[model samples]
Target: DHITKDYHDHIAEISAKLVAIMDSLFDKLLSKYEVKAPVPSPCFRNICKQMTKMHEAIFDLLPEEQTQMLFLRINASYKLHLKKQLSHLNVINDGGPQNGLVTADVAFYTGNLQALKGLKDLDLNMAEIWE
Candidate 1:
């Protein structure tokens, strides 16, 4: 029982740290992003690299289920953060080339998330941002 307790405690710690890592990796990533741009942003390109590093660090330590759960939780937080940040743009919902840009950016994120082992079928629920 005590061992089980410690395991959960450690998971809690790791979960907290994952968000910090996510935030750090995402720091100002969209600051210069232009919704009218043709392709993904320059800083945006490395997002998968950053996320893969995070996953590699945790993958060996946890079971597949736990590992995926961690990503799911982090994904939720990431989506929320991205949605909020996009909202700050204020012009995102105004329409025009915005859909193309936002859709392109989301594809990058979706690609990265799906590339993770066993997560190919994960639903990003990215449409929430449009709502």
Candidate 2:
């Protein structure tokens, strides 16, 4: 019982750190939060900081191949999702964030963030659904 409890505690703590990390990464990518009428696709770098630190924590607590597979997949899915969301000019939504804080369209950012809100937990629960 204690072992299971500690495992959950570890998961909760790391998941919190991961959530913080996600916010920071999005902020970093959003440095180009410029609005000069249409974005410069050429200048877009599409970079998200590597989760090496998070991976180290994950490796310590989780199994091996699942670590690599799950982390890579979650990262890739997140990046791709952001790109798809940003492709829209959001001219549909009052031309997107005028405050210069958001990196993507309002609708896009909102939906994307919502999707990612449960990312770590989604990965964490993959095995639980199995036989």
Candidate 3:
């Protein structure tokens, strides 16, 4: 089944690697992002566009074809699991708490949009498989 201990273990390991890769990508992008300036929609849109480019990078870090497939399956299950809990929407594009980009977590979002997107998708996708 998808809920096995080994399943969670592998997912968690792979997911964390993806998160680190994305995080570094954003830190660089964020450097050019204006500081002390309220982020605008254009900037947010740019961030989203840049984030999409990292999916391939994410896969590069995955175990292999089988693990990538496993990641996809675990992703749906993770979303289903979250749906049962908060029943919330995907996420907002604003620059607030729920907005995610500027919120790279534990710390401010910085430029880690790629990191944020990767980790979030993976967690809902398969990171929890590690858990």
Cα TM-score per model? 0.80, 0.37, 0.34
The order of the candidates by lDDT, greatest first, is: 1, 3, 2
Q: How much is the lDDT of residue 49 in candidate 3?
A: 55
Summed backbone clashes in each candidate are 0, 0, 10
lDDT, model 1, position 24: 61
lDDT string for model 1 (3-38, tens) is 988887788787777777776656456555556565
Q: Give a tens-digit lDDT track for model 3, residues 32-110.
A: 4432334433444454555455454555565554444444443343334333322233443355654443333312222
* lDDT, candidate 2, 1-131, per-residue tens: 79978775666565555655655665555444444434322223233224444555566666554454555454444444344334443322233454232333332322332243223333332211111
Better candidate number, 2 or 3, judged by TM-score: 2
Give the TM-score comparing model 1 with the true structure, all chains together.
0.80
lDDT of each: 0.72, 0.42, 0.42
lDDT of 3: 0.42
Candidate whose lDDT is highest = 1
Residue 69's lDDT in candidate 3: 49
Index of the highest-TM-score prediction: 1
Better of 1 and 3 by lDDT: 1
Let me know the TM-score candidate 2 reaches against the reference structure: 0.37
lDDT of residue 99 for candidate 3: 42
The superposed Cα distance between candidate 3 and the true structure at residue 18, in angstroms, equals 1.0
